[PDB]
Coordinates of C-alpha atoms in Angstrom, one line a residue:
Chain A
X1 CA 201.3 71.5 -28.1
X2 CA 198.4 72.2 -25.8
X3 CA 197.8 72.8 -22.1
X4 CA 194.0 72.5 -21.2
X5 CA 193.1 73.7 -17.7
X6 CA 189.7 72.9 -16.0
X7 CA 188.5 76.0 -14.2
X8 CA 185.3 74.8 -12.3
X9 CA 182.2 72.6 -12.3
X10 CA 179.0 73.7 -10.7
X11 CA 175.5 72.4 -10.2
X12 CA 172.8 75.0 -9.4
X13 CA 170.2 72.5 -8.4
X14 CA 171.7 68.9 -8.2
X15 CA 169.7 68.3 -11.4
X16 CA 172.1 69.7 -14.0
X17 CA 175.7 70.9 -14.0
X18 CA 178.0 72.9 -16.3
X19 CA 181.8 72.7 -16.7
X20 CA 184.2 75.5 -17.6
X21 CA 187.7 75.5 -18.9
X22 CA 190.7 77.7 -19.8
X23 CA 192.5 77.7 -23.2
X24 CA 196.3 77.4 -23.4
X25 CA 197.0 79.0 -34.0
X26 CA 193.7 77.1 -34.6
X27 CA 192.5 76.0 -31.1
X28 CA 189.9 73.1 -31.1
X29 CA 188.5 72.1 -27.6
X30 CA 186.4 69.0 -27.0
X31 CA 185.3 67.5 -23.7
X32 CA 184.7 63.8 -22.8
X33 CA 183.6 62.4 -19.5
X34 CA 183.5 58.9 -18.1
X35 CA 181.7 57.1 -15.3
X36 CA 183.2 54.8 -12.6
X37 CA 182.2 51.1 -13.0
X38 CA 181.3 50.6 -16.7
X39 CA 183.5 53.2 -18.3
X40 CA 181.8 53.9 -21.6
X41 CA 183.7 56.8 -23.0
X42 CA 181.8 59.5 -24.8
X43 CA 182.0 63.2 -25.8
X44 CA 180.1 66.0 -24.0
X45 CA 176.4 66.5 -24.8
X46 CA 176.2 70.2 -25.7
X47 CA 178.5 73.1 -25.3
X48 CA 176.2 75.8 -26.6
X49 CA 173.6 76.4 -23.9
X50 CA 176.0 77.4 -21.1
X51 CA 177.9 79.5 -23.6
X52 CA 181.7 79.8 -24.2
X53 CA 184.1 77.3 -22.9
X54 CA 181.2 75.4 -21.3
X55 CA 179.7 72.0 -21.4
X56 CA 176.2 71.6 -20.0
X57 CA 174.8 68.4 -18.6
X58 CA 171.0 68.0 -18.8
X59 CA 168.9 66.1 -16.3
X60 CA 169.2 63.2 -18.8
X61 CA 173.0 63.0 -18.3
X62 CA 173.1 64.3 -14.7
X63 CA 173.0 61.5 -12.2
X64 CA 174.0 62.0 -8.5
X65 CA 174.7 58.2 -8.3
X66 CA 178.0 58.2 -10.3
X67 CA 181.4 59.9 -10.0
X68 CA 182.5 61.9 -13.1
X69 CA 186.0 61.6 -14.6
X70 CA 186.1 64.6 -16.9
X71 CA 188.9 65.7 -19.3
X72 CA 189.4 68.4 -22.0
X73 CA 191.4 67.7 -25.2
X74 CA 192.8 70.4 -27.5
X75 CA 193.6 69.2 -31.0
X76 CA 195.3 71.4 -33.5
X77 CA 198.0 69.6 -35.5
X78 CA 201.4 68.9 -33.9
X79 CA 199.9 70.3 -30.7
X80 CA 197.1 67.8 -29.6
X81 CA 196.8 66.8 -25.9
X82 CA 194.7 66.1 -22.9
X83 CA 194.0 67.8 -19.6
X84 CA 194.3 66.9 -15.9
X85 CA 191.3 64.7 -15.2
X86 CA 188.6 66.1 -12.8
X87 CA 186.7 63.9 -10.5
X88 CA 183.2 65.3 -9.7
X89 CA 180.5 64.3 -7.3
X90 CA 177.4 66.2 -8.4
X91 CA 176.3 67.0 -4.9
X92 CA 179.6 68.4 -3.7
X93 CA 179.5 71.1 -6.4
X94 CA 176.2 73.0 -5.5
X95 CA 176.1 76.7 -6.6
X96 CA 172.5 77.7 -5.8
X97 CA 170.1 80.4 -7.1
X98 CA 169.9 83.8 -5.4
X99 CA 167.2 83.3 -2.6
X100 CA 163.9 83.8 -4.2
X101 CA 161.5 86.5 -2.8
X102 CA 162.8 89.3 -0.7
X103 CA 160.5 91.4 1.5
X104 CA 161.5 94.6 3.4
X105 CA 158.9 94.9 6.1
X106 CA 159.8 98.2 8.0
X107 CA 158.1 99.1 11.3
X108 CA 161.7 100.9 17.7
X109 CA 162.0 101.6 14.0
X110 CA 163.7 98.7 12.3
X111 CA 163.8 97.0 8.9
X112 CA 162.3 93.6 8.9
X113 CA 163.8 91.4 6.1
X114 CA 162.4 88.1 4.9
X115 CA 163.2 85.8 2.0
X116 CA 162.8 82.3 0.5
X117 CA 165.2 79.6 -0.5
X118 CA 165.8 78.4 -4.2
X119 CA 164.8 74.9 -5.3
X120 CA 162.6 72.7 -2.9
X121 CA 170.5 72.6 5.1
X122 CA 171.6 76.1 4.1
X123 CA 173.2 79.2 5.6
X124 CA 172.3 82.7 4.4
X125 CA 173.9 86.1 4.4
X126 CA 172.6 89.6 3.7
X127 CA 174.4 92.8 2.8
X128 CA 173.1 96.4 2.7
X129 CA 174.4 99.8 1.9
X130 CA 172.6 103.2 2.2
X131 CA 173.6 104.1 -1.4
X132 CA 175.3 107.2 -0.2
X133 CA 178.1 104.8 0.8
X134 CA 179.8 102.8 -1.9
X135 CA 180.4 99.8 0.3
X136 CA 178.4 97.2 2.2
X137 CA 178.0 96.3 5.8
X138 CA 177.3 92.6 5.7
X139 CA 175.3 90.5 8.2
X140 CA 175.3 86.7 8.9
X141 CA 171.9 85.2 9.4
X142 CA 172.9 81.6 9.9
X143 CA 169.9 79.5 9.0
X144 CA 167.1 82.1 9.2
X145 CA 164.6 83.0 6.5
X146 CA 164.2 86.4 8.1
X147 CA 166.5 89.0 9.7
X148 CA 165.9 92.0 11.9
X149 CA 168.1 95.0 11.0
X150 CA 167.9 97.5 13.8
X151 CA 169.6 100.9 13.6
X152 CA 169.6 102.8 10.3
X153 CA 169.7 106.4 9.0
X154 CA 166.1 107.4 8.4
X155 CA 164.6 108.9 5.2
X156 CA 167.4 107.2 3.2
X157 CA 167.3 104.7 0.3
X158 CA 169.0 101.4 1.0
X159 CA 170.2 98.6 -1.2
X160 CA 170.0 94.9 0.0
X161 CA 171.0 91.5 -1.5
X162 CA 171.2 88.0 -0.1
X163 CA 173.2 84.7 -0.4
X164 CA 173.0 81.1 0.5
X165 CA 175.3 78.1 0.9
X166 CA 174.1 74.5 0.9
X167 CA 175.5 72.3 3.7
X168 CA 178.2 70.9 1.5
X169 CA 179.0 73.3 -1.3
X170 CA 179.8 76.8 -2.6
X171 CA 178.1 80.2 -2.1
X172 CA 175.4 81.4 -4.5
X173 CA 175.2 84.6 -6.5
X174 CA 174.0 87.8 -4.9
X175 CA 170.3 88.4 -5.3
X176 CA 168.3 91.4 -6.8
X177 CA 168.9 94.7 -5.0
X178 CA 165.7 95.9 -3.3
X179 CA 165.3 99.6 -2.2
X180 CA 163.6 100.9 0.9
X181 CA 162.7 104.1 2.8
Chain B
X1 CA 189.4 65.4 -6.2
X2 CA 186.1 65.0 -4.2
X3 CA 186.2 65.6 -0.4
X4 CA 186.0 61.9 0.7
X5 CA 188.6 60.4 -1.6
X6 CA 192.3 59.5 -1.1
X7 CA 194.9 56.9 -1.9
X8 CA 193.4 56.1 -5.2
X9 CA 191.4 58.9 -7.0
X10 CA 190.2 56.1 -9.3
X11 CA 187.3 53.7 -8.7
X12 CA 186.7 55.9 -5.6
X13 CA 183.2 54.8 -4.5
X14 CA 180.8 57.1 -2.8
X15 CA 180.9 56.6 1.1
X16 CA 177.9 55.0 2.6
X17 CA 177.6 57.9 5.0
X18 CA 176.3 60.3 2.3
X19 CA 175.0 57.6 0.1
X20 CA 172.0 57.2 2.4
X21 CA 172.0 60.9 3.1
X22 CA 170.8 61.3 -0.5
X23 CA 168.3 58.4 -0.5
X24 CA 166.7 59.5 2.7
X25 CA 166.1 62.9 1.3
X26 CA 164.4 61.4 -1.7
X27 CA 162.0 59.0 0.0
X28 CA 161.2 61.9 2.3
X29 CA 160.4 64.2 -0.6
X30 CA 158.4 61.5 -2.4
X31 CA 156.0 60.6 0.5
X32 CA 155.7 64.3 1.5
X33 CA 154.7 64.8 -2.1
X34 CA 152.4 61.9 -2.8
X35 CA 150.9 62.8 0.6
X36 CA 149.6 66.1 -0.6
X37 CA 149.0 64.6 -4.0
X38 CA 146.4 62.5 -2.2
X39 CA 145.0 65.4 -0.1
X40 CA 144.2 67.2 -3.4
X41 CA 142.5 64.1 -4.9
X42 CA 140.4 63.5 -1.7
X43 CA 139.3 67.1 -1.3
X44 CA 138.4 67.6 -5.0
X45 CA 136.7 64.3 -5.5
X46 CA 135.6 62.3 -2.4
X47 CA 133.4 57.0 1.0
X48 CA 136.4 54.7 1.7
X49 CA 136.4 51.0 1.8
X50 CA 139.8 49.6 0.9
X51 CA 141.7 46.8 2.7
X52 CA 143.5 45.7 -0.4
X53 CA 147.0 46.9 -1.4
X54 CA 149.3 44.9 -3.8
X55 CA 152.1 45.2 -1.2
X56 CA 150.5 43.1 1.4
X57 CA 151.8 39.8 0.2
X58 CA 155.3 40.9 1.4
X59 CA 156.7 40.1 4.8
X60 CA 156.6 43.8 6.0
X61 CA 157.7 44.6 9.5
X62 CA 154.7 46.5 10.8
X63 CA 155.6 47.4 14.4
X64 CA 158.6 49.0 15.9
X65 CA 159.6 45.8 17.4
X66 CA 159.4 43.7 14.3
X67 CA 161.6 46.3 12.6
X68 CA 164.4 46.2 15.2
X69 CA 164.2 42.4 14.7
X70 CA 164.8 42.3 11.0
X71 CA 168.2 41.6 9.3
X72 CA 169.7 44.8 7.8
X73 CA 170.7 42.9 4.6
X74 CA 167.0 41.7 4.1
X75 CA 165.7 45.2 4.8
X76 CA 167.2 46.5 1.6
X77 CA 166.0 43.5 -0.4
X78 CA 162.7 44.4 1.2
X79 CA 162.8 48.2 0.5
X80 CA 163.7 47.6 -3.2
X81 CA 161.0 45.0 -3.7
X82 CA 158.5 47.7 -2.9
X83 CA 160.0 50.5 -5.1
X84 CA 160.2 48.1 -8.0
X85 CA 156.6 47.1 -7.6
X86 CA 155.7 50.7 -7.6
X87 CA 157.2 51.5 -11.0
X88 CA 154.6 50.0 -13.3
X89 CA 151.6 51.5 -11.6
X90 CA 153.2 55.0 -11.5
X91 CA 153.5 55.0 -15.3
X92 CA 149.9 54.1 -15.8
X93 CA 148.9 56.8 -13.3
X94 CA 150.9 59.4 -15.3
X95 CA 149.8 58.3 -18.8
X96 CA 146.2 57.9 -17.8
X97 CA 145.7 61.2 -16.2
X98 CA 147.7 62.8 -18.9
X99 CA 146.1 61.0 -21.8
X100 CA 142.5 60.0 -22.6
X101 CA 141.5 61.8 -19.4
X102 CA 140.2 65.3 -20.3
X103 CA 142.7 66.8 -17.9
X104 CA 141.4 67.9 -14.5
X105 CA 143.1 69.7 -11.6
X106 CA 146.8 69.3 -12.1
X107 CA 147.5 66.5 -9.6
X108 CA 149.5 65.5 -12.8
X109 CA 152.2 67.9 -11.8
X110 CA 152.8 66.1 -8.5
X111 CA 152.6 62.7 -10.2
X112 CA 155.3 63.3 -12.8
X113 CA 157.8 64.5 -10.2
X114 CA 156.9 61.4 -8.2
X115 CA 157.5 59.1 -11.1
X116 CA 160.9 60.7 -11.8
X117 CA 162.1 60.8 -8.2
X118 CA 160.9 57.3 -7.5
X119 CA 163.0 55.8 -10.3
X120 CA 165.9 58.1 -9.3
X121 CA 165.7 56.8 -5.8
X122 CA 165.4 53.2 -7.0
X123 CA 168.8 53.3 -8.7
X124 CA 170.3 54.7 -5.5
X125 CA 168.9 51.6 -4.0
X126 CA 170.5 49.2 -6.4
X127 CA 173.7 51.0 -5.7
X128 CA 173.4 50.5 -1.9
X129 CA 172.5 46.9 -2.3
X130 CA 175.5 46.6 -4.7
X131 CA 177.8 47.7 -2.0
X132 CA 176.6 45.1 0.4
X133 CA 176.6 42.1 -1.9
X134 CA 174.4 39.1 -1.0
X135 CA 167.8 41.2 -6.8
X136 CA 164.7 39.1 -6.2
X137 CA 161.0 38.8 -7.2
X138 CA 158.3 41.5 -6.3
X139 CA 154.5 41.6 -6.0
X140 CA 152.5 42.1 -9.1
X141 CA 150.2 45.1 -9.8
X142 CA 146.8 43.8 -11.0
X143 CA 144.5 46.8 -10.8
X144 CA 145.3 47.6 -14.5
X145 CA 141.7 47.4 -15.9
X146 CA 140.4 49.4 -12.9
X147 CA 142.5 52.4 -14.0
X148 CA 131.5 54.0 -14.3
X149 CA 132.8 57.1 -12.5
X150 CA 132.0 55.9 -9.0
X151 CA 133.8 52.6 -9.5
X152 CA 136.8 54.0 -11.4
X153 CA 137.2 56.9 -9.0
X154 CA 137.4 54.4 -6.2
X155 CA 140.3 52.5 -8.0
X156 CA 142.2 55.7 -8.3
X157 CA 141.5 56.2 -4.7
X158 CA 142.9 52.8 -3.6
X159 CA 146.1 53.3 -5.7
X160 CA 146.7 56.8 -4.5
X161 CA 146.2 55.7 -1.0
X162 CA 148.7 52.8 -1.0
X163 CA 151.3 55.2 -2.4
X164 CA 150.9 57.2 0.7
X165 CA 150.9 54.0 2.8
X166 CA 154.0 52.5 1.2
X167 CA 156.1 55.6 0.6
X168 CA 155.8 56.0 4.3
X169 CA 157.1 52.4 5.1
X170 CA 160.0 53.0 2.7
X171 CA 160.9 56.4 4.0
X172 CA 160.6 55.2 7.6
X173 CA 162.9 52.2 6.9
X174 CA 165.7 54.3 5.4
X175 CA 165.5 56.6 8.4
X176 CA 166.0 53.4 10.4
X177 CA 168.8 51.8 8.4
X178 CA 170.8 55.1 8.0
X179 CA 170.5 55.5 11.7
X180 CA 171.4 51.9 12.6
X181 CA 174.4 51.4 10.4
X182 CA 176.0 54.9 10.0
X183 CA 175.2 56.2 13.5
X184 CA 173.3 53.8 15.9
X185 CA 173.6 56.9 18.1
Chain C
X1 CA 109.5 55.2 29.1
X2 CA 113.2 54.8 29.7
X3 CA 115.3 54.9 26.5
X4 CA 118.3 52.7 25.2
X5 CA 121.7 54.4 25.2
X6 CA 121.5 56.6 22.1
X7 CA 124.8 56.7 20.3
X8 CA 128.4 57.0 21.3
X9 CA 130.6 59.3 19.3
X10 CA 134.3 58.3 18.8
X11 CA 136.1 60.7 16.6
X12 CA 139.5 61.7 18.1
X13 CA 142.6 59.5 17.9
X14 CA 146.3 60.2 18.7
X15 CA 149.6 58.4 19.0
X16 CA 152.4 60.3 20.8
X17 CA 155.2 57.8 20.0
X18 CA 154.5 55.7 16.9
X19 CA 154.5 52.7 19.2
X20 CA 151.4 53.0 21.3
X21 CA 148.1 54.8 20.6
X22 CA 145.0 56.0 22.3
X23 CA 141.3 56.7 21.5
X24 CA 138.5 58.8 23.1
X25 CA 134.7 58.5 22.7
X26 CA 131.7 60.6 23.6
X27 CA 129.0 58.9 25.7
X28 CA 125.5 58.9 24.3
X29 CA 122.4 60.6 25.7
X30 CA 122.3 57.5 28.1
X31 CA 118.6 57.3 28.5
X32 CA 118.0 57.5 32.2
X33 CA 119.8 54.4 33.4
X34 CA 123.5 53.8 34.2
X35 CA 125.4 53.1 30.9
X36 CA 128.5 50.8 30.6
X37 CA 130.7 51.1 27.5
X38 CA 133.1 48.7 25.7
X39 CA 135.2 48.9 22.6
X40 CA 135.7 46.4 19.7
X41 CA 137.9 46.8 16.7
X42 CA 139.2 44.9 13.6
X43 CA 142.7 45.0 12.1
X44 CA 143.0 45.3 8.3
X45 CA 143.1 42.0 6.4
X46 CA 142.0 39.9 9.3
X47 CA 138.3 39.3 10.0
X48 CA 138.7 38.8 13.7
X49 CA 136.9 41.2 16.2
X50 CA 139.0 42.0 19.3
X51 CA 138.3 43.7 22.6
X52 CA 140.1 46.8 24.0
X53 CA 142.9 45.8 26.4
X54 CA 143.2 48.9 28.5
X55 CA 140.4 51.1 29.6
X56 CA 142.2 52.8 32.5
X57 CA 145.6 54.0 31.2
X58 CA 144.4 57.0 29.1
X59 CA 141.7 57.7 31.6
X60 CA 138.0 58.2 31.5
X61 CA 136.2 57.4 28.2
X62 CA 139.5 56.2 26.7
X63 CA 141.1 53.2 25.2
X64 CA 144.9 52.8 25.4
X65 CA 146.9 50.4 23.2
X66 CA 150.2 49.1 24.5
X67 CA 153.1 48.5 22.0
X68 CA 151.9 44.9 21.7
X69 CA 148.5 45.7 20.3
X70 CA 149.5 48.9 18.5
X71 CA 150.8 48.4 14.9
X72 CA 151.5 51.0 12.2
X73 CA 150.6 50.9 8.5
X74 CA 147.4 49.1 9.5
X75 CA 143.8 50.5 9.2
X76 CA 141.9 49.9 12.4
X77 CA 138.1 49.7 12.1
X78 CA 137.3 50.9 15.6
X79 CA 133.7 50.7 16.9
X80 CA 132.3 51.4 20.5
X81 CA 129.2 49.9 22.1
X82 CA 127.1 51.9 24.6
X83 CA 125.2 49.2 26.5
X84 CA 122.7 50.4 29.2
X85 CA 120.2 48.2 31.2
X86 CA 117.3 48.5 28.7
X87 CA 118.6 48.2 25.2
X88 CA 121.9 48.8 23.4
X89 CA 123.6 50.8 20.6
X90 CA 126.8 50.9 18.6
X91 CA 128.8 53.8 17.2
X92 CA 129.3 54.8 13.6
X93 CA 132.4 52.7 12.9
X94 CA 135.7 54.6 12.5
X95 CA 138.8 53.8 10.4
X96 CA 141.9 54.8 12.1
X97 CA 145.4 53.8 11.0
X98 CA 148.2 54.6 13.5
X99 CA 150.3 56.1 10.7
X100 CA 148.9 59.7 10.3
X101 CA 147.6 60.2 13.8
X102 CA 151.0 61.2 15.4
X103 CA 151.3 64.1 17.9
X104 CA 154.1 64.3 20.4
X105 CA 154.3 66.3 23.6
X106 CA 156.6 69.3 23.5
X107 CA 160.4 69.6 23.8
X108 CA 162.1 69.7 27.2
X109 CA 165.3 71.0 28.8
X110 CA 165.1 74.2 26.8
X111 CA 168.4 75.8 27.6
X112 CA 169.4 79.2 26.1
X113 CA 173.1 80.3 25.9
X114 CA 175.0 83.3 24.7
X115 CA 178.2 82.8 23.0
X116 CA 180.6 85.2 21.3
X117 CA 182.3 83.9 18.2
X118 CA 184.9 85.0 15.6
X119 CA 185.2 88.8 15.7
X120 CA 182.3 91.1 16.8
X121 CA 179.8 88.2 16.6
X122 CA 177.5 87.5 19.6
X123 CA 174.9 84.7 18.7
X124 CA 172.1 83.3 20.8
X125 CA 172.5 79.6 20.9
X126 CA 169.2 77.7 21.4
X127 CA 169.5 74.2 22.7
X128 CA 167.0 71.5 23.8
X129 CA 166.2 67.8 23.6
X130 CA 163.2 65.6 22.4
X131 CA 160.5 64.1 24.7
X132 CA 161.8 61.1 26.7
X133 CA 159.1 58.8 25.2
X134 CA 160.1 59.4 21.6
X135 CA 162.6 57.0 20.0
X136 CA 164.6 59.2 17.7
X137 CA 167.9 57.5 18.5
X138 CA 166.9 54.2 16.6
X139 CA 165.6 56.5 13.9
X140 CA 162.2 54.9 14.2
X141 CA 160.8 58.3 15.2
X142 CA 161.9 61.5 13.4
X143 CA 161.4 65.0 14.8
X144 CA 161.4 68.4 13.1
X145 CA 161.4 71.5 15.2
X146 CA 160.5 75.1 15.3
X147 CA 161.3 77.9 17.7
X148 CA 159.7 81.2 18.2
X149 CA 161.0 84.1 20.2
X150 CA 159.8 87.7 20.9
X151 CA 160.9 90.4 23.4
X152 CA 159.0 90.3 26.7
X153 CA 156.3 92.8 25.7
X154 CA 155.6 92.6 22.0
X155 CA 152.9 91.9 19.4
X156 CA 154.5 89.4 17.0
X157 CA 156.7 86.3 17.4
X158 CA 159.4 85.3 14.9
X159 CA 159.5 81.7 13.7
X160 CA 162.5 79.5 12.8
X161 CA 162.2 76.0 11.4
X162 CA 165.1 73.8 12.4
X163 CA 164.2 70.4 11.1
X164 CA 165.7 67.6 13.2
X165 CA 168.5 69.8 14.7
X166 CA 168.2 70.0 18.4
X167 CA 170.1 73.3 18.6
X168 CA 169.8 76.6 16.8
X169 CA 171.6 79.9 16.5
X170 CA 169.8 83.3 16.3
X171 CA 171.5 86.5 15.0
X172 CA 168.9 89.3 15.2
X173 CA 168.6 90.5 18.8
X174 CA 169.0 94.1 20.0
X175 CA 171.4 93.7 22.9
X176 CA 170.0 94.0 26.5
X177 CA 166.5 93.0 25.5
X178 CA 164.7 90.4 27.5
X179 CA 163.6 87.9 24.9
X180 CA 161.3 84.9 25.4
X181 CA 161.7 81.6 23.7
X182 CA 159.5 78.5 23.0
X183 CA 159.8 75.2 21.1
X184 CA 157.3 72.9 19.4
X185 CA 157.8 69.7 17.4
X186 CA 156.3 68.1 14.2
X187 CA 157.2 64.5 13.6
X188 CA 158.5 63.0 10.4
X189 CA 155.1 63.6 9.1
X190 CA 152.3 64.7 11.5
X191 CA 150.7 67.0 14.0
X192 CA 152.6 69.9 15.6
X193 CA 152.6 69.7 19.4
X194 CA 151.7 72.5 21.8
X195 CA 154.5 74.9 22.6
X196 CA 157.0 74.2 25.4
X197 CA 157.7 75.8 28.7
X198 CA 159.3 79.1 27.8
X199 CA 162.6 80.5 29.0
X200 CA 164.0 84.0 28.7
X201 CA 167.4 85.6 28.4
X202 CA 168.7 89.2 28.6
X203 CA 172.1 90.7 27.7

């Protein structure tokens, strides 16, 4: 037998997306996606570039204009089967890039934070910890490119990271941790 | 399963609501991209005497009134007659600048993006015309041989300029339609 | 001994609604006689000269175009004729298309609320509406927005873009401060207007 389970599909930029699965003896996985309308059936483009248990769709295969029926089929002898199909709309699965550029513009002594979005509406979030503490106090910025953090413990070295979530989609990764004085 | 689907997961069909929402975004990006793609040509290279765009033969609603008077069905047929006409010229633009032109300031950059997005947006058009079932003929691009430095720079100008003129019409129409059909609000 | 008019200078044009537009000229030297001005223009494609319809509406030295005579995606070749008692002179013709000359008045009914939300969260909710003239409901006209706020005495404003959302939520405000708040609006594509009448809040 076999029991293939589709973990997730995400698109960092509405321009390419990658799909990940879970296994479940010689295990051979292969992916095959279909479009609504014409239904030509063909195997995934390349598995390599997004790594292990991944199928990556280039901007040549990635169209926001068609809904994707996607299945995974594991084929060792007397144990060859197909997975629960997954319907994906490219624009409902956005997992963005950590907000590019992060400035820590200190001075009524406050830390002034500013950042920039990824490619090209979107909520953000920032967290920071003084480094002495091994947890973060997290702040919601709504839709601002810059946030004013007021009261802090002077002379200390802080760690800050940001996040973003497109209108309809999932959070991003945490950004690169800038230090301050 | 995607957020807007029920009953039958198959066939499915992307709701109009966010079918425009994507097409508006594109025509917005395109014009706001060919607009600065023009501003970089002008600055870096240039007189203006041009009352000739290939898209003038078409029955374009060129007032706010005339627009609010035009049939929604025919507005798409309209919108896509433009986009289609824009396809050829955009490929000469990109090949010409790229090619036998000893490459200058990288307006190119902006012009590749524009060629991609255009065609991307055009297929989102055929999909939206497909959902409201009634393709027709579109105005022919003739300034091929046009694409002297004074005379050839002027031909580039005219082309570049109309792109800014039309990509505004187009964008401004989809703003309309999206906000007539979806919400008339 | 007494000169002809000199030369009128029309350079500035603006359309605050994408339906009607308006143009202002600069009278010539004028010689030494009384000088009376008039405006003729040609629409793209056509080869018909017309006469300005409205000299009064936009005021002194101004030509106003009602919706009827205004039309976008056209390139108007506007030219103005200074015409005094002894001689006459035209302006250097100008090419204005209604398309890229947009510039609205500022936002109105700027109202500023405090709201507490889910758990230890007190956001400042910025609300307002577009200028009565502008037709954003039919989608014809499309507005983007910006707001800026600073504490009453201060040195720098902070700026928040809020494209076509006529409300905004601000999270960085040291409680009890008297902040000031203003709004300004770009169109679809065009010229940012002047700031709006400011309001303040305190908590």
